[PDB]
Symmetry: C3
Subunit: 133 residues, 3 copies
Amino acid sequence: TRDFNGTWEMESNENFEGYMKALDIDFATRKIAVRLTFTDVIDQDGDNFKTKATSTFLNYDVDFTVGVEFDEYTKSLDNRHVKALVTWEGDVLVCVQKGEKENRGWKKWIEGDKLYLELTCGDQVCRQVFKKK
Amino acid sequence: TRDFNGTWEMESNENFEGYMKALDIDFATRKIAVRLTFTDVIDQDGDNFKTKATSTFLNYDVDFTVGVEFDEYTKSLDNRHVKALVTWEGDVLVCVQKGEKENRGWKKWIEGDKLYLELTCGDQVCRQVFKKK
Amino acid sequence: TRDFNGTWEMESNENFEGYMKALDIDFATRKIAVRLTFTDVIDQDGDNFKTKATSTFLNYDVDFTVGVEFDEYTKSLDNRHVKALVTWEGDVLVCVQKGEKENRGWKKWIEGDKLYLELTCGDQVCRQVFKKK
């Protein structure tokens, strides 16, 4: 069909970074665009086209079972490969990420109606708290 | 007129880069902030003000008709000036963007309810697939 | 408790930059990630977990009363500390931000249903106009 009309949500994006590298794009905007997804609204009347490309950040998925070792590529962060294992310590989810970095992992627990997540590596700890919606 | 209450959506942003350069802001976040739009929710009680400044990415717009060469400032990416021409090859939209980069263009076609877009430059092609929502 | 099911919206992010630096993450993606907040939807059936981490830009909140000088940490821009004061010039909000940069401030006013904001540092002025929604 010749009809490109409608709203299109991206599902795949292969060699986007290589394409941008060939375009002589700069490290900053290459790192910006590599963490996105796009939706194109095309309005097409015969041979007249009006396109609008909206971009937002691509969700990151992590699926695991407690006690089962899995392979995690932290595309969210440093894009490293680690072997991750999660355990129950009382009501605490303790995850160890074995790999190049020492003392790397996180701990997650809930107090009241708020969630507490401590991400750790080398000596740097990061404390984040989330509210339930 | 002293009443700033409400949600205000941006329509213009002139010399934002120059303002940030005068603030001597760094290339990374300058490249991030130049691709944004802002919406300010103001709650104003007399002389008391409560600000919310939300930031969103900039919708990239492209309007063209098949067969007429047009001028494209390829923002979103390398911010280059190209002379672009799109043609129908059967049911495929093939556009070549003549400019500094050689063999630069793209192809667009439809299979069922999926859109296929191949962006090309030198030897690097990037394949993207979109689902209709 | 051991039930992490639901949607959790972030309200703090402490030592994120040190954590990312320890991960040997790059200035570009560190500068982007410091300008974000996250919302995680967790689906947990017993010991099976399915997490989805959505990313959205941060919200720059600014609270002031007209005539009272306040302290502003411009995390949106140069991450500088300035002592800011807002005054009425007719129906225009004129704010001076005393600090390292000279002649730094802004002006805000309403014409009809549009908002006009002029950000003024050294020699560079930046004009932004918003439409009321």
